[PDB]
Amino acid sequence: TYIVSTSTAFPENYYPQTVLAAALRRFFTVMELDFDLEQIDRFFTNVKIDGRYFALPLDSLLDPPTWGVSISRGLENSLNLAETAITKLLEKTNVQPQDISLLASVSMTPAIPSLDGRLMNRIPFSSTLKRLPMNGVGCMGGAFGISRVADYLKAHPKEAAILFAVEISSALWQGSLQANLTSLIRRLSLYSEIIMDIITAALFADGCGAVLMVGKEHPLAKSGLPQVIDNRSFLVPNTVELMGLDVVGFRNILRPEVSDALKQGLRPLINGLLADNNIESENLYRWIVHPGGPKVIDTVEAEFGLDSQTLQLSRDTLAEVGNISSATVLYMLDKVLSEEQSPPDSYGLIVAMGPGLAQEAILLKW
Amino acid sequence: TYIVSTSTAFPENYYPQTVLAAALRRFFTVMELDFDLEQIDRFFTNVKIDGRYFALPLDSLLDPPTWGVSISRGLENSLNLAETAITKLLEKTNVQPQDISLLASVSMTPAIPSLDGRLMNRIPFSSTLKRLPMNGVGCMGGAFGISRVADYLKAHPKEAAILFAVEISSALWQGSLQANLTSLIRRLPENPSLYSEIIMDIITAALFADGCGAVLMVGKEHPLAKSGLPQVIDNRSFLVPNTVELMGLDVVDNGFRNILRPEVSDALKQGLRPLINGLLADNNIESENLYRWIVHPGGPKVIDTVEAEFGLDSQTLQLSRDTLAEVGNISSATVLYMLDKVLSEEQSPPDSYGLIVAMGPGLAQEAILLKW
Ligand SMILES: C[C@@H](CCCC[C@@H](C)Cl)Cc1cc(O)cc(O)c1
Numbered sequence: 001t002y003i004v005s006t007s008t009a010f011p012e013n014y015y016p017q018t019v020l021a022a023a024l025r026r027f028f029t030v031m032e033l034d035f036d037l038e039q040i041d042r043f044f045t046n047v048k049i050d051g052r053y054f055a056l057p058l059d060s061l062l063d064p065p066t067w068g069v070s071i072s073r074g075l076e077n078s079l080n081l082a083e084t085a086i087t088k089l090l091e092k093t094n095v096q097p098q099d100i101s102l103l104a105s106v107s108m109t110p111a112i113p114s115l116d117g118r119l120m121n122r123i124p125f126s127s128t129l130k131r132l133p134m135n136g137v138g139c140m141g142g143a144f145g146i147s148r149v150a151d152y153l154k155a156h157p158k159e160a161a162i163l164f165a166v167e168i169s170s171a172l173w174q175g176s177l178q179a180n181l182t183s184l185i186r187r188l189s190l191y192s193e194i195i196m197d198i199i200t201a202a203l204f205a206d207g208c209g210a211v212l213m214v215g216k217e218h219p220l221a222k223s224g225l226p227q228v229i230d231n232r233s234f235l236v237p238n239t240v241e242l243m244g245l246d247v248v249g250f251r252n253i254l255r256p257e258v259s260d261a262l263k264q265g266l267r268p269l270i271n272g273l274l275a276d277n278n279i280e281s282e283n284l285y286r287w288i289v290h291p292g293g294p295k296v297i298d299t300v301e302a303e304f305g306l307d308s309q310t311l312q313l314s315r316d317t318l319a320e321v322g323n324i325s326s327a328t329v330l331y332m333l334d335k336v337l338s339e340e341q342s343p344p345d346s347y348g349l350i351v352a353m354g355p356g357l358a359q360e361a362i363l364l365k366w
Numbered sequence: 367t368y369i370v371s372t373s374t375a376f377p378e379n380y381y382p383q384t385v386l387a388a389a390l391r392r393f394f395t396v397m398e399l400d401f402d403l404e405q406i407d408r409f410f411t412n413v414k415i416d417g418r419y420f421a422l423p424l425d426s427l428l429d430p431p432t433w434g435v436s437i438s439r440g441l442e443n444s445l446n447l448a449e450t451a452i453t454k455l456l457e458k459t460n461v462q463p464q465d466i467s468l469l470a471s472v473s474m475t476p477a478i479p480s481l482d483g484r485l486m487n488r489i490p491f492s493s494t495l496k497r498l499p500m501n502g503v504g505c506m507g508g509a510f511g512i513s514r515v516a517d518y519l520k521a522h523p524k525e526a527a528i529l530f531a532v533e534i535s536s537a538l539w540q541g542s543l544q545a546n547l548t549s550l551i552r553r554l555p556e557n558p559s560l561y562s563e564i565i566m567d568i569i570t571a572a573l574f575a576d577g578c579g580a581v582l583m584v585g586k587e588h589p590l591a592k593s594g595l596p597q598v599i600d601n602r603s604f605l606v607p608n609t610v611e612l613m614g615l616d617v618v619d620n621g622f623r624n625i626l627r628p629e630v631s632d633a634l635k636q637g638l639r640p641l642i643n644g645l646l647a648d649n650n651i652e653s654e655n656l657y658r659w660i661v662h663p664g665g666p667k668v669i670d671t672v673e674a675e676f677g678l679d680s681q682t683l684q685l686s687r688d689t690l691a692e693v694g695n696i697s698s699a700t701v702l703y704m705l706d707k708v709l710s711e712e713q714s715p716p717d718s719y720g721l722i723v724a725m726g727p728g729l730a731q732e733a734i735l736l737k738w
Contacts, residue, residue, distance in 0.1 A: 067617070067618075067619055068616075068617070068619045071616075105502075111502050112501070112502050112503075112504055112614045113504070113610060113613075113614050113727035113729075114503065116502075117502065117605055117610070118610055120605050120728075121607055121608055121610065127605055127606075127637075128604055128641070128644075129603065129605070130517075131603065132500070133502040133503065134499060134500060135478070135480065136480025136481070136482075136483065136499040136501070137478075137479070138478055151518060151522075152521070154521035154522075155518075155520035156517075156520075232494055233494055233495065234494055235483055235486050235493055235497075236493070237487060237493070238487055240483070240487065243479075246434075246437075247434065247437045247476045265493075269494070272494070355478050357479075358479065358483060358497075
């Protein structure tokens with residue numbers, strides 16, 4: 001199974017992290033919330049993000065629209081970004097939509113029917129297009145989706161598939177964060193809850209990524225493209241409460257313990273996958289690690305004894321676009337394929353972590 | 367790919383359809399809503415359902431709990447039913463959880479992480495279990511799940527997979543239906559166009575129910591792949607262009623709203639015959655030689671439409687009507703309940719062909735070709 005090409009799509013408004021921090025400080029100031037505002041600045045700086053794309057508005061932070069309207073805009077933005085990314089992908093590869101056998105999607109955006117079904121009215125896919133709409137995987141979704149498409153293409157060596165991941169984190173800013181922070185600060189053991197919501201506001205951003213993958217018999221399956229040679233999943237027992245998304249609007253759950261609980265899954269997962277492919281982690285030329293946060297990046301480095309430069313792509317990505325959740329690893333893979341040189345027959349590893357607590361690893365070979 | 371076994375799981379409270387109709391009438395009356403109460407009886411009767419399982423309380427009609435409490439209850443009940451069904455499936459097949467390679471789930475219950483991930487803490491699956499949590503498919507999810515798992519097992523002939531589907535339709539009775547019907551009826555005098563909206567919500571209240579089905583599927587080289595079992599020999603999807611608005615589930619201010627427009631049955635015709643005719647033709651089969659049909663009963667009109675389109679004798683879809691009467695429309699789980707009934711029927715004649723058909727949001731249709 002071969003990764004042939006990638007693309008990304010972002011909304012029009014890129015906000016410097018300092019603008020975002022200032023907007024939230026305005027909110028605390030207007031609502032007379034008793035909390036150190038330097039905590040807002042400290043967390044927005046310490047996540048090491050230079051700016052983020054928000055598809056949904058910031059100008060209405062003090063007067064958010066209704067929940068129904070925010071869901072409607074989030075759905076429309078998700079569809080628009082996904083259409084843009086898919087159309088760029090087909091164009092750069094000169095592939096016709098009718099020649100795509102499977103369209104796989106990941107997104108936390110509420111969509112029944114799913115985003116991939118809706119896109120069939122915007123792009124002239126065949127009416128018998130196979131679809132793989134996935135959810136419940138959060139930040140892990142991009143890596144997760146690549147593994148699922150690879151497993152499909154193992155049985156369909158002649159076919160082509162598109163995976164896309166899109167998330168609208170800015171939906172958080174349409175009332176959920178405002179209400180929750182106001183209530184928590186006013187009742188202030190709740191200090192950690194306020195910190196978590198501030199971290200959520202500092203970290204998460206919007207965007208979309210897409211990947212074209214083909215089986216070994218497809219005409220686009222050529223040497224020098226990354227090959228998915230194996231993949232594996234891991235779920236750490238009894239960690240459901242550490243990460244996820246609770247409907248309340250909604251609240252992002254990201255407990256401080258997450259980075260430590262990752263150690264329980266990372267090495268069992270990756271070391272077992274590599275051993276079963278007769279290589280060691282030190283054989284890997286390229287790591288593509290989802291930047292859940294600065295501490296996640298540091299933990300992966302420590303667990304595998306990596307040099308300070310090996311995960312630089314995770315840090316640069318986080319600086320450039322923030323944590324765009326499931327889409328992040330696709331953006332990163334896009335950077336590798338577009339801007340970087342990969343030695344022939346070198347090995348790469350995609351790693352992502354998300355709610356469950358779950359981790360996903362994909363072994364690549366050029 | 368072989369279908370080895372099936373199981374179901376239902377909550378403890380089964381309500382007669384007449385009690386449910388009376389509960390909604392009581393809500394209209396206590397709220398003093400100016401709507402013809404006989405329309406509730408009409409639709410609760412015309413869906414041809416005798417009773418339904420409700421996991422969530424009927425008292426929430428008059429005293430709705432908070433949105434978060436209802437979501438938490440829905441999640442807990444989804445997990446409990448799925449665990450029961452999976453455990454019954456593993457016990458009846460004498461299969462250890464560690465020998466399951468893939469666990470696929472379909473459900474509209476909001477769950478991040480997905481229900482299949484949470485179940486790994488209840489059932490000793492191995493930590494490297496592969497998961498396939500699908501969503502955005504609604505009533506079609508059962509048949510859709512079968513197809514995706516069959517596609518997976520094409521590439522993994524020695525592996526075993528479990529699919530489960532679970533839906534808690536009674537969540538709409540925890541405040542969404544009450545809020546929407548109230549607003550729609552009260553705005554009706556100034557806006558007559560809202561009448562069809564009120565009927566739709568009444569139909570939703572009449573039709574959808576709770577439950578769970580699960581299926582064990584294995585690849586051709588698995589030791590459980592034996593001749594008597596139904597084999598998935600092909601499957602196909604279809605999506606009808608420009609029909610998103612006819613069926614789905616929207617998140618709104620009132621909570622959730624189920625969308626099911628009267629035009630669905632007619633739009634069904636646009637997809638059903640190209641889908642099924644093409645699937646059958648590509649496998650050198652004609653519909654008249656099908657031994658069995660397993661058609662998701664989206665409604666009585668849906669059943670009649672499938673019957674008419676394929677010129678079926680009206681006993682051919684009797685299992686759709688019997689299922690609707692017994693448990694109502696339990697959405698993605700329904701075809702799994704139906705398949706479980708079939709596997710308790712007379713040993714299907716060897717080399718007999720069967721077709722699973724289900725329709726759902728998109729508007730999308732899924733057809734699966736079985737051979738016994
Ligand atoms: C829009 C919200 C809605 C919450 C779930 C409610 C439904 C299951 Cl009923 C989810 C979301 C969060 C996020 O951080 C990025 C996204 O793309 C999407």
